[PDB]
Short mmCIF file of C-alpha atoms in Angstrom, two decimals:
data_model
loop_
_atom_site.label_atom_id
_atom_site.label_comp_id
_atom_site.label_asym_id
_atom_site.label_seq_id
_atom_site.Cartn_x
_atom_site.Cartn_y
_atom_site.Cartn_z
CA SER A 9 142.75 61.25 -83.08
CA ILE A 10 143.92 64.37 -84.92
CA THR A 11 141.93 64.41 -88.14
CA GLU A 12 142.90 66.00 -91.45
CA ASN A 13 140.78 68.81 -92.88
CA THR A 14 141.69 69.45 -96.52
CA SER A 15 139.34 72.41 -96.89
CA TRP A 16 141.58 74.55 -94.67
CA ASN A 17 144.46 74.17 -97.13
CA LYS A 18 142.68 76.67 -99.38
CA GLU A 19 143.59 79.52 -97.04
CA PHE A 20 147.24 78.43 -97.27
CA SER A 21 147.12 78.02 -101.06
CA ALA A 22 145.62 81.49 -101.43
CA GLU A 23 148.76 83.09 -100.01
CA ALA A 24 151.17 80.42 -101.23
CA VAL A 25 152.23 79.63 -97.66
CA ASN A 26 153.59 76.27 -96.28
CA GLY A 27 152.50 75.69 -92.74
CA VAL A 28 149.96 74.13 -90.40
CA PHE A 29 146.89 75.06 -88.42
CA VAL A 30 145.70 72.89 -85.55
CA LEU A 31 142.29 73.69 -84.11
CA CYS A 32 140.64 71.78 -81.26
CA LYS A 33 137.09 72.08 -79.92
CA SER A 34 136.62 71.52 -76.17
CA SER A 35 139.81 69.46 -75.61
CA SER A 36 142.98 68.17 -77.26
CA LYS A 37 141.13 64.92 -78.00
CA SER A 38 139.10 66.61 -80.77
CA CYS A 39 141.62 68.32 -83.02
CA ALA A 40 141.76 68.96 -86.75
CA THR A 41 144.53 70.22 -89.02
CA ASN A 42 145.25 71.01 -92.68
CA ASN A 43 148.62 69.24 -92.47
CA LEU A 44 148.95 66.01 -90.51
CA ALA A 45 152.72 65.64 -90.97
CA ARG A 46 153.53 69.22 -90.03
CA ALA A 47 151.31 69.31 -86.96
CA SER A 48 153.71 66.96 -85.15
CA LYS A 49 156.94 68.51 -86.46
CA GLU A 50 158.89 70.42 -83.80
CA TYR A 51 160.09 73.98 -84.40
CA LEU A 52 161.84 76.67 -82.32
CA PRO A 53 159.09 78.27 -80.18
CA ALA A 54 160.61 81.82 -80.35
CA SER A 55 158.36 84.31 -78.45
CA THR A 56 155.60 81.74 -77.88
CA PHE A 57 157.94 80.60 -75.09
CA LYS A 58 156.95 83.75 -73.18
CA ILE A 59 153.93 81.71 -72.04
CA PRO A 60 155.76 79.03 -70.02
CA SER A 61 158.46 81.53 -69.12
CA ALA A 62 155.99 84.00 -67.51
CA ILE A 63 154.40 81.14 -65.59
CA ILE A 64 157.80 79.94 -64.28
CA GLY A 65 158.86 83.55 -63.61
CA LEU A 66 155.86 83.88 -61.27
CA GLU A 67 156.22 80.42 -59.78
CA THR A 68 159.87 80.99 -58.86
CA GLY A 69 159.16 84.51 -57.58
CA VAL A 70 161.32 86.27 -60.16
CA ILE A 71 158.10 88.03 -61.22
CA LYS A 72 156.63 89.28 -57.94
CA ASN A 73 152.95 89.22 -58.88
CA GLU A 74 150.57 90.41 -61.59
CA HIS A 75 151.47 94.05 -60.95
CA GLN A 76 155.20 93.56 -61.68
CA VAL A 77 156.62 96.35 -63.80
CA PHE A 78 159.59 95.70 -66.11
CA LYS A 79 162.26 98.23 -67.04
CA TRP A 80 163.29 98.25 -70.72
CA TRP A 81 163.81 107.31 -72.30
CA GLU A 82 162.82 103.72 -71.58
CA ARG A 83 159.17 103.41 -70.56
CA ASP A 84 158.53 100.50 -68.20
CA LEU A 85 156.21 97.68 -69.25
CA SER A 86 153.44 95.68 -67.57
CA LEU A 87 153.47 91.87 -67.80
CA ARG A 88 150.94 92.05 -70.64
CA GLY A 89 153.12 94.76 -72.24
CA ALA A 90 156.26 92.65 -71.94
CA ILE A 91 154.41 89.69 -73.42
CA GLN A 92 153.16 91.62 -76.48
CA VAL A 93 156.20 93.70 -77.54
CA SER A 94 159.56 92.39 -78.56
CA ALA A 95 160.88 92.86 -75.09
CA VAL A 96 163.81 90.64 -76.05
CA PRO A 97 165.63 91.86 -72.96
CA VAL A 98 162.63 91.42 -70.65
CA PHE A 99 162.24 87.69 -71.17
CA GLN A 100 165.99 87.18 -71.51
CA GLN A 101 166.36 88.67 -68.06
CA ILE A 102 163.56 86.59 -66.54
CA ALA A 103 165.16 83.39 -67.92
CA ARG A 104 168.60 84.27 -66.44
CA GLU A 105 166.94 85.02 -63.09
CA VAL A 106 165.11 81.67 -63.19
CA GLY A 107 168.40 79.88 -64.15
CA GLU A 108 169.17 76.55 -65.92
CA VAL A 109 168.23 74.06 -63.16
CA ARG A 110 164.84 75.57 -62.33
CA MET A 111 163.99 76.17 -65.99
CA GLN A 112 164.76 72.53 -66.83
CA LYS A 113 162.66 71.26 -63.97
CA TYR A 114 159.62 73.29 -65.00
CA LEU A 115 159.87 72.37 -68.69
CA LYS A 116 159.89 68.70 -67.67
CA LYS A 117 156.81 69.21 -65.51
CA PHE A 118 155.07 71.10 -68.33
CA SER A 119 155.99 68.46 -70.96
CA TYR A 120 157.25 71.29 -73.14
CA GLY A 121 158.48 70.09 -76.49
CA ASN A 122 161.85 68.33 -76.62
CA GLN A 123 162.68 69.96 -73.27
CA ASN A 124 166.13 70.91 -74.55
CA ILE A 125 167.32 74.23 -73.15
CA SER A 126 170.83 73.99 -74.57
CA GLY A 127 172.25 77.07 -76.24
CA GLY A 128 172.35 79.73 -73.48
CA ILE A 129 170.00 80.33 -70.53
CA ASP A 130 168.94 83.73 -71.97
CA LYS A 131 168.51 82.59 -75.59
CA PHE A 132 167.59 78.95 -75.81
CA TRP A 133 164.10 79.56 -77.15
CA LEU A 134 165.43 82.04 -79.72
CA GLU A 135 168.81 80.67 -80.81
CA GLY A 136 169.02 77.40 -78.90
CA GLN A 137 168.03 73.75 -79.21
CA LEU A 138 164.47 74.01 -77.89
CA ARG A 139 161.78 72.74 -80.28
CA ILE A 140 158.04 72.11 -79.89
CA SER A 141 155.19 71.03 -82.21
CA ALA A 142 151.83 72.61 -82.94
CA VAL A 143 150.12 69.66 -81.29
CA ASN A 144 152.28 70.06 -78.11
CA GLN A 145 151.43 73.77 -78.00
CA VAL A 146 147.71 72.94 -77.91
CA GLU A 147 148.15 70.31 -75.22
CA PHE A 148 150.17 72.74 -73.09
CA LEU A 149 147.59 75.56 -73.57
CA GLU A 150 144.83 73.15 -72.65
CA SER A 151 146.67 72.31 -69.43
CA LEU A 152 146.99 76.07 -68.72
CA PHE A 153 143.33 76.67 -69.46
CA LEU A 154 142.39 73.90 -66.98
CA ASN A 155 144.89 75.10 -64.36
CA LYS A 156 146.55 71.68 -64.50
CA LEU A 157 150.14 72.84 -65.03
CA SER A 158 152.48 72.42 -62.04
CA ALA A 159 152.15 75.97 -60.80
CA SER A 160 149.70 77.77 -58.49
CA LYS A 161 146.25 78.39 -59.95
CA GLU A 162 146.78 82.08 -59.24
CA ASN A 163 149.91 82.26 -61.41
CA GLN A 164 148.23 80.40 -64.28
CA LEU A 165 145.28 82.78 -64.02
CA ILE A 166 147.63 85.81 -64.07
CA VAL A 167 149.24 84.63 -67.33
CA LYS A 168 145.88 83.72 -68.89
CA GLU A 169 144.61 87.25 -68.30
CA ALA A 170 147.86 88.84 -69.62
CA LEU A 171 147.35 86.89 -72.88
CA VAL A 172 143.92 88.40 -73.68
CA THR A 173 144.19 90.06 -77.11
CA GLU A 174 140.56 90.42 -78.27
CA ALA A 175 137.38 90.82 -76.29
CA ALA A 176 133.82 90.68 -77.69
CA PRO A 177 130.45 90.25 -75.98
CA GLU A 178 130.51 86.59 -76.97
CA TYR A 179 134.17 85.56 -76.64
CA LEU A 180 137.66 86.35 -75.33
CA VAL A 181 140.73 85.47 -77.46
CA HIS A 182 143.98 84.64 -75.62
CA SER A 183 146.91 84.43 -78.07
CA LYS A 184 150.64 84.87 -78.57
CA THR A 185 152.84 85.31 -81.70
CA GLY A 186 156.41 84.24 -82.36
CA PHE A 187 158.95 84.53 -85.13
CA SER A 188 162.37 82.95 -85.40
CA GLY A 189 163.63 85.22 -88.15
CA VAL A 190 163.62 84.74 -91.95
CA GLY A 191 166.36 82.05 -92.37
CA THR A 192 167.28 80.83 -95.96
CA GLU A 193 165.24 78.53 -98.19
CA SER A 194 167.71 75.80 -97.13
CA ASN A 195 166.46 76.64 -93.59
CA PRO A 196 163.33 78.78 -93.62
CA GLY A 197 162.47 80.77 -90.48
CA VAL A 198 159.22 79.83 -88.62
CA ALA A 199 156.34 82.15 -87.58
CA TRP A 200 153.73 81.23 -85.02
CA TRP A 201 150.34 82.14 -83.60
CA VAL A 202 148.98 80.02 -80.70
CA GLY A 203 146.09 80.57 -78.26
CA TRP A 204 142.53 79.67 -77.36
CA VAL A 205 139.11 81.29 -77.66
CA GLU A 206 136.53 81.07 -74.86
CA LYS A 207 133.24 81.41 -76.73
CA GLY A 208 130.21 81.08 -74.46
CA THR A 209 130.64 77.78 -72.62
CA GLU A 210 132.83 76.45 -75.38
CA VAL A 211 136.62 76.61 -75.77
CA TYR A 212 138.74 76.23 -78.89
CA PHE A 213 142.53 75.73 -78.74
CA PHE A 214 144.71 76.64 -81.72
CA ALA A 215 148.30 76.58 -82.93
CA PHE A 216 149.57 77.88 -86.29
CA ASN A 217 153.06 77.86 -87.71
CA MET A 218 154.43 78.63 -91.18
CA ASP A 219 157.69 78.89 -93.09
CA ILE A 220 158.66 82.54 -93.56
CA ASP A 221 161.50 83.83 -95.70
CA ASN A 222 160.43 87.47 -95.83
CA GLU A 223 159.32 89.82 -93.06
CA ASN A 224 156.51 91.07 -95.32
CA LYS A 225 154.64 87.79 -94.85
CA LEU A 226 154.44 88.16 -91.05
CA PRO A 227 150.77 89.22 -90.97
CA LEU A 228 149.65 85.92 -92.47
CA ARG A 229 150.42 84.20 -89.19
CA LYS A 230 147.34 85.94 -87.77
CA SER A 231 145.19 86.46 -90.91
CA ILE A 232 145.24 82.85 -92.05
CA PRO A 233 144.14 81.39 -88.72
CA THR A 234 141.64 84.23 -88.25
CA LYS A 235 140.03 83.45 -91.63
CA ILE A 236 139.73 79.77 -90.67
CA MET A 237 138.24 80.49 -87.26
CA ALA A 238 135.96 83.14 -88.71
CA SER A 239 134.66 80.51 -91.16
CA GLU A 240 133.78 78.15 -88.32
CA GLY A 241 131.83 80.95 -86.66
CA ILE A 242 134.22 81.07 -83.70
CA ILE A 243 135.42 84.69 -83.87
CA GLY A 244 134.48 87.64 -86.10
CA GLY A 245 136.38 88.26 -89.34
CA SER B 39 140.66 115.04 -51.40
CA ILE B 40 138.62 114.49 -54.56
CA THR B 41 138.86 117.42 -56.97
CA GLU B 42 135.84 118.82 -58.81
CA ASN B 43 136.31 119.11 -62.58
CA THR B 44 133.65 121.62 -63.61
CA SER B 45 134.27 121.06 -67.32
CA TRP B 46 133.14 117.43 -67.35
CA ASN B 47 129.64 118.75 -66.75
CA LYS B 48 129.54 119.80 -70.39
CA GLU B 49 129.26 116.14 -71.45
CA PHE B 50 126.25 115.81 -69.16
CA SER B 51 124.57 119.04 -70.31
CA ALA B 52 125.06 117.97 -73.93
CA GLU B 53 122.69 115.08 -73.33
CA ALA B 54 120.58 116.73 -70.65
CA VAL B 55 121.50 113.99 -68.17
CA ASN B 56 121.81 114.36 -64.42
CA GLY B 57 124.64 112.13 -63.18
CA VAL B 58 128.14 111.83 -61.73
CA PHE B 59 131.43 110.46 -63.04
CA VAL B 60 134.35 109.66 -60.71
CA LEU B 61 137.71 108.81 -62.37
CA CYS B 62 140.90 108.17 -60.33
CA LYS B 63 144.47 107.68 -61.60
CA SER B 64 146.57 105.09 -59.76
CA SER B 65 144.52 104.97 -56.54
CA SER B 66 141.37 106.34 -54.89
CA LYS B 67 143.64 109.04 -53.44
CA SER B 68 143.80 110.93 -56.76
CA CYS B 69 140.18 111.17 -57.92
CA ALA B 70 138.27 113.82 -59.85
CA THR B 71 134.51 114.18 -60.39
CA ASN B 72 132.09 116.58 -62.12
CA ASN B 73 130.04 116.83 -58.89
CA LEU B 74 131.35 116.29 -55.33
CA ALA B 75 127.86 116.21 -53.85
CA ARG B 76 126.63 113.37 -56.03
CA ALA B 77 129.94 111.46 -55.89
CA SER B 78 129.07 110.46 -52.34
CA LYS B 79 125.33 109.89 -52.82
CA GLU B 80 124.31 106.21 -52.56
CA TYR B 81 122.16 104.63 -55.25
CA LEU B 82 120.80 101.15 -55.89
CA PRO B 83 123.60 99.06 -57.45
CA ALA B 84 121.35 97.06 -59.76
CA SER B 85 123.56 94.69 -61.85
CA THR B 86 126.82 96.27 -60.70
CA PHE B 87 126.10 94.04 -57.68
CA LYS B 88 127.03 91.11 -59.94
CA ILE B 89 130.67 91.98 -59.05
CA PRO B 90 130.54 91.29 -55.28
CA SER B 91 127.94 88.57 -55.89
CA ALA B 92 130.32 86.67 -58.20
CA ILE B 93 133.20 86.94 -55.75
CA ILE B 94 131.01 85.81 -52.82
CA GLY B 95 129.51 82.97 -54.90
CA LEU B 96 133.02 81.70 -55.68
CA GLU B 97 134.19 82.29 -52.09
CA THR B 98 131.31 80.24 -50.69
CA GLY B 99 131.74 77.50 -53.34
CA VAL B 100 128.23 78.22 -54.72
CA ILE B 101 130.06 78.90 -57.95
CA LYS B 102 132.48 75.95 -58.31
CA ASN B 103 135.27 77.64 -60.27
CA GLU B 104 135.85 79.79 -63.33
CA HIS B 105 134.57 77.05 -65.58
CA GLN B 106 131.13 76.86 -63.90
CA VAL B 107 128.22 76.94 -66.38
CA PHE B 108 124.79 78.41 -65.52
CA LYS B 109 121.43 77.29 -66.94
CA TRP B 110 119.48 80.09 -68.65
CA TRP B 111 115.50 76.66 -75.16
CA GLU B 112 118.31 79.11 -74.45
CA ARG B 113 121.84 77.79 -74.08
CA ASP B 114 123.69 77.84 -70.78
CA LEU B 115 125.97 80.79 -69.94
CA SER B 116 129.56 81.09 -68.76
CA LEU B 117 130.40 83.33 -65.76
CA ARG B 118 131.41 86.12 -68.19
CA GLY B 119 128.19 85.58 -70.14
CA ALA B 120 126.03 85.63 -66.99
CA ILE B 121 127.76 88.81 -65.84
CA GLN B 122 127.11 90.57 -69.14
CA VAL B 123 123.51 89.76 -70.02
CA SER B 124 120.36 90.00 -67.95
CA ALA B 125 120.37 86.63 -66.31
CA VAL B 126 118.69 88.02 -63.22
CA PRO B 127 117.55 84.48 -62.17
CA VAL B 128 121.22 83.35 -62.19
CA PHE B 129 122.34 85.83 -59.56
CA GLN B 130 119.07 85.40 -57.71
CA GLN B 131 119.90 81.70 -57.35
CA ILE B 132 123.40 82.51 -56.19
CA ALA B 133 122.21 84.88 -53.51
CA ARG B 134 119.65 82.30 -52.30
CA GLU B 135 122.33 79.66 -51.91
CA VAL B 136 124.70 82.11 -50.21
CA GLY B 137 121.86 83.02 -47.87
CA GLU B 138 121.32 86.13 -45.75
CA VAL B 139 123.82 85.58 -42.95
CA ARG B 140 126.90 85.01 -45.17
CA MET B 141 125.75 87.76 -47.55
CA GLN B 142 125.63 90.26 -44.67
CA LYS B 143 129.09 89.13 -43.50
CA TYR B 144 130.73 89.56 -46.90
CA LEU B 145 129.19 93.00 -47.51
CA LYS B 146 130.64 94.17 -44.19
CA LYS B 147 134.04 92.72 -45.07
CA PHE B 148 133.71 94.47 -48.43
CA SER B 149 132.48 97.76 -46.93
CA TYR B 150 129.79 97.64 -49.62
CA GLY B 151 127.65 100.78 -49.46
CA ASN B 152 125.05 100.87 -46.71
CA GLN B 153 125.20 97.07 -46.45
CA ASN B 154 121.39 96.99 -46.18
CA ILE B 155 120.18 93.69 -47.62
CA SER B 156 116.77 93.75 -45.99
CA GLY B 157 113.69 92.49 -47.82
CA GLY B 158 114.19 89.50 -50.15
CA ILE B 159 117.58 87.75 -50.20
CA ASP B 160 117.08 87.54 -53.97
CA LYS B 161 116.01 91.10 -54.74
CA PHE B 162 117.82 93.42 -52.37
CA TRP B 163 120.15 94.86 -55.01
CA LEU B 164 117.43 95.02 -57.66
CA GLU B 165 114.55 96.66 -55.78
CA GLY B 166 115.54 96.62 -52.11
CA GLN B 167 117.27 98.99 -49.75
CA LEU B 168 120.92 98.39 -50.69
CA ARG B 169 122.66 101.57 -51.87
CA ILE B 170 126.25 102.48 -52.78
CA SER B 171 127.96 105.66 -54.00
CA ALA B 172 130.19 106.17 -57.04
CA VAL B 173 133.18 106.80 -54.70
CA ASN B 174 132.41 103.57 -52.81
CA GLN B 175 132.32 101.65 -56.12
CA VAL B 176 135.79 102.97 -56.96
CA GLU B 177 137.15 102.03 -53.51
CA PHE B 178 135.73 98.51 -53.91
CA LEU B 179 137.14 98.05 -57.44
CA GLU B 180 140.53 99.28 -56.23
CA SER B 181 140.47 96.67 -53.43
CA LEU B 182 139.55 94.00 -56.02
CA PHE B 183 142.31 95.21 -58.41
CA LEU B 184 144.85 94.92 -55.60
CA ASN B 185 143.50 91.54 -54.39
CA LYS B 186 142.75 93.18 -51.03
CA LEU B 187 139.18 91.98 -50.71
CA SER B 188 138.38 89.35 -48.11
CA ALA B 189 138.47 86.46 -50.57
CA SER B 190 141.15 84.24 -52.17
CA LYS B 191 143.42 85.84 -54.77
CA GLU B 192 142.27 83.16 -57.25
CA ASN B 193 138.60 84.12 -56.88
CA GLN B 194 139.47 87.80 -57.25
CA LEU B 195 141.43 87.12 -60.44
CA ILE B 196 138.63 84.94 -61.86
CA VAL B 197 136.12 87.78 -61.49
CA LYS B 198 138.51 90.41 -62.80
CA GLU B 199 139.04 88.36 -65.97
CA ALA B 200 135.26 87.79 -66.48
CA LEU B 201 134.85 91.59 -66.40
CA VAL B 202 137.19 92.25 -69.39
CA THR B 203 135.11 94.12 -71.98
CA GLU B 204 137.69 95.75 -74.30
CA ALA B 205 141.18 94.61 -75.21
CA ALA B 206 143.72 96.68 -77.17
CA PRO B 207 147.51 96.41 -77.50
CA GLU B 208 147.92 99.26 -75.05
CA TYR B 209 145.14 98.58 -72.46
CA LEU B 210 142.49 96.28 -71.03
CA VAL B 211 139.11 97.66 -69.90
CA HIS B 212 137.22 95.78 -67.15
CA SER B 213 133.66 97.15 -66.70
CA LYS B 214 130.13 96.36 -65.58
CA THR B 215 126.83 98.08 -66.40
CA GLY B 216 123.74 98.41 -64.23
CA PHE B 217 120.21 99.63 -64.76
CA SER B 218 117.47 99.63 -62.14
CA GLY B 219 114.64 100.32 -64.63
CA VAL B 220 112.82 103.57 -65.46
CA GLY B 221 111.33 104.30 -62.02
CA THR B 222 108.56 106.92 -61.60
CA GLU B 223 107.79 110.63 -61.59
CA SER B 224 109.43 111.58 -58.30
CA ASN B 225 111.77 108.58 -58.45
CA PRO B 226 113.57 107.87 -61.69
CA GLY B 227 115.69 104.76 -62.14
CA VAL B 228 119.48 104.72 -62.06
CA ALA B 229 121.95 103.52 -64.71
CA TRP B 230 125.63 102.74 -64.02
CA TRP B 231 128.93 101.94 -65.69
CA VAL B 232 131.82 101.13 -63.34
CA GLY B 233 135.26 99.58 -63.96
CA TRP B 234 138.95 100.22 -64.42
CA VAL B 235 141.41 100.52 -67.31
CA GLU B 236 144.87 98.95 -67.13
CA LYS B 237 146.87 101.06 -69.56
CA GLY B 238 150.58 100.19 -69.73
CA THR B 239 151.75 100.35 -66.14
CA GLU B 240 149.03 102.81 -65.04
CA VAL B 241 145.48 102.07 -63.85
CA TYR B 242 142.44 104.32 -63.86
CA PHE B 243 139.31 103.46 -61.78
CA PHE B 244 135.93 104.90 -62.79
CA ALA B 245 132.32 104.91 -61.65
CA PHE B 246 129.40 106.60 -63.44
CA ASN B 247 125.73 106.82 -62.54
CA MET B 248 122.85 108.84 -63.96
CA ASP B 249 119.14 109.24 -63.43
CA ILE B 250 117.14 107.52 -66.16
CA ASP B 251 113.42 107.59 -66.92
CA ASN B 252 113.45 106.42 -70.52
CA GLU B 253 115.16 103.29 -71.80
CA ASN B 254 116.32 105.17 -74.91
CA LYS B 255 118.94 107.03 -72.84
CA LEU B 256 120.62 103.80 -71.64
CA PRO B 257 123.69 103.97 -74.00
CA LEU B 258 124.80 107.29 -72.48
CA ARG B 259 125.95 105.28 -69.44
CA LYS B 260 128.88 104.19 -71.62
CA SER B 261 129.28 107.09 -74.08
CA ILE B 262 129.54 109.85 -71.45
CA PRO B 263 132.40 108.18 -69.51
CA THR B 264 134.01 106.99 -72.73
CA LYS B 265 133.95 110.55 -74.01
CA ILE B 266 135.54 111.81 -70.79
CA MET B 267 138.18 109.10 -70.54
CA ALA B 268 139.05 109.34 -74.26
CA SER B 269 139.44 113.09 -73.73
CA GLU B 270 141.93 112.33 -70.99
CA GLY B 271 143.77 110.02 -73.42
CA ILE B 272 142.99 106.81 -71.49
CA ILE B 273 141.04 104.69 -73.99
CA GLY B 274 140.04 106.90 -76.91
CA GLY B 275 139.85 103.82 -79.13
#
């Protein structure tokens, strides 16, 4: 079962950040985390929801294929482009096109978090009632990696390639950020970084989230997990 | 018609290399080259033949799926790993299992060079009679990029992802080297670098080959095209 790794807390203590890193080698049956309690806590996914949303976009035909171009003077974006930027409008538009009933059906098939899309079809993952844990992110990414989600293998492949963010001779990193917004310290915002690294014949799944009350701490969402994975010899510093 | 860009020749003269670079924006209908005569000349593909070989191996089920692992005590390799290193025995095994008849059929469907696979089923692209031009490489990569090759879309996407060699926020480079060896006096070897860059919503296809008689010149197969494409503002860095 998910085991606790106290050594990783040092990277959090260094920056005085409250949050969780879940890292799994080969499968979701071999995970480790610095914070047992927090690993299972559900938080708004924010832009990490672009992962299921792009898959359902393709599956429903709202996104024609991997070459779909998205309008925002306004330069158009590729699917990878729309994933990376804050194309708030892009993914708001794809969700409206998909619509409540189809979105609900796919989130139930994907076992995505609390599966609650209340709060507005074009904003539920930003302002709505949707919540998901770090553990559930890894399990979903593992299903994507194995082409086991309820979607064609071609559409899962198309989203896997669009998520590539770092390539090296030895490994490819697929990842996605997310940020709810700063909040108050009665209700701190949440920042995320989730993904997986194919290194040789091995695969590592990861999911990070943290409390964030100032936009200046945004970089930590990638530097903390990168320092941890660099320590394990998975990716370069 | 392909235009001849006289100025690119300066990157070749700088290193006293004889070669050709073909770079096309959007489709093979808008290509430029330093030398029209050599753009059409067919050369041994060497390891650039790992591209078609990987698609055919998946198409025939010799390669099970993207998660197939190959034996080299050196560790096993992934498909991306086997594509990148010299794992000549890997692709030799693949070709043997595909066999001559299916191999001939798929090279015709692919319009792959002169389609001459005579001699050994496991050495034709290494030391045999198979030859392909830089323009033909570009046409073949364009067909792969569009999923127009005679193979499933899934297998095309699996190969395209295994070819990712550089990832940046603005673009993904997919590429493949090749090197036939140093050859002889009246018959130098050939070195290649072919691929395509997906930059925003645009795509550029490229194919470079040069004569090579000394292994110390091998890195020019990437620096000459990189210099040219960076000059055109495609990848710089």
